[PDB]
Amino acid sequence: ARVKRGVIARARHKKILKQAKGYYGARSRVYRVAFQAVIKAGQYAYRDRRQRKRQFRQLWIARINAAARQNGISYSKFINGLKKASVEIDRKILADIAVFDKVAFTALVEKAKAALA
């Protein structure tokens, strides 16, 4: 019972090269080079499903800092005031209010100031 390989070996290489589309040079043509590219791509994808949260939170924090300083208070004091304002529960991601609705954001700032005062 001699097994002749071939079909399955070609299928695996086809799978890897299909995943390796769009890469420059031999990374999308040669199986040896392409396979290393796919593994590194998976590693980078894994690490960045984690880094995405940090990046977006950082963007939101910078955003809220800009808006709060526009209204006349720093980010740290604004967050402290919102925390002390009868345990008001708002969001860093909800800082799109600072982009879309300015009067709502200044309403938030008003009672942040009231709570701190």
Q: What whole-number distance in Å separates Cα of residue 40 and Cα of residue 60?
A: 30
Considering the complex, state which of residue 82 and residue 98 has its C-beta at the smaller distance from RNA. Answer: 98
Q: Which of residues 9-68 bind RNA (CB under 7 A)?
A: 9-10, 13, 21-27, 29-32, 36-37, 39-41, 44-45, 47-49, 51-52, 55
Position of tokens 């894994």? Answer: 46
Identify residue 24 by its one-letter amino acid code. Answer: Y
Q: What whole-number distance in Å separates Cα of residue 90 and Cα of residue 111?
A: 13
Nearest of 46, 38, 32, 33 to residue 20 by alpha carbon: 38
Nearest of 73, 71, 74 to residue 98 by alpha carbon: 71
Q: Is residue 93 a contact point for RNA (CB under 7 A)? A: no
Min dist CB 6 to RNA, Å, is 4
Min dist CB 50 to RNA, Å, is 10
Considering the complex, state which of residue 7 and residue 103 has its C-beta at the smaller distance from RNA. Answer: 7
Binding footprint of RNA on the chain (CB under 7 A): 1-2, 4-6, 9-10, 13, 21-27, 29-32, 36-37, 39-41, 44-45, 47-49, 51-52, 55
